[PDB]
Input
Amino acid sequence: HRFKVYNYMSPTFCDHCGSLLWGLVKQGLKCEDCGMNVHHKCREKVANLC
Amino acid sequence: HRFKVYNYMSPTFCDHCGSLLWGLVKQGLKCEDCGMNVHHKCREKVANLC
Ligand SMILES: CC(=O)O[C@@]12[C@H](O)[C@@H](C)[C@@]3(O)[C@@H](C=C(CO)C[C@]4(O)C(=O)C(C)=C[C@@H]34)[C@@H]1C2(C)C
Ligand SMILES: CC(=O)O[C@@]12[C@H](O)[C@@H](C)[C@@]3(O)[C@@H](C=C(CO)C[C@]4(O)C(=O)C(C)=C[C@@H]34)[C@@H]1C2(C)C
Ligand SMILES: [Zn+2]
Ligand SMILES: [Zn+2]
Ligand SMILES: [Zn+2]
Ligand SMILES: [Zn+2]
Output
């Protein structure tokens, strides 16, 4: 995965843990290749294979 | 047009005046119906028909 911080425009959940990507900006990281969305705290918890 | 503030993820220009939508967040307003992107200052300058 190529995770880069993303500022989300509508409520998006973390594809790893299920909770909302909280906040007004920079709520989480979206993988540039597959679109997976994770919380900053959940990025270390995701498997590496994209 | 239904313009709402948008936080852009890559350099986007104003569809009205041609300059970059400056800034890290809330750089401009994107029309929810047609995707037109404008600077906060250019919204008053756009024609109403979408
Ligand atoms: C139109 C729109 O929903 O814009 C927003 C709303 O104002 C806001 C209530 C929002 O929908 C938000 C998007 C995300 C992402 O997960 C997170 C939130 O801010 C959030 O924590 C809650 C509880 C609602 C989410 C985005 C933005 C642009 C801040
Ligand atoms: C990957 C990426 O380009 O992210 C960014 C870059 O860090 C940054 C240099 C950027 O590309 C930016 C998007 C826009 C919109 O017009 C405005 C800018 O911040 C800007 O003023 C300049 C001079 C580059 C633009 C977005 C974000 C997410 C802040
Ligand atoms: Zn991926
Ligand atoms: Zn999570
Ligand atoms: Zn429009
Ligand atoms: Zn403009």
Remarks:
- The beta strands of chain B are 3-6, 28-31, 37-38.
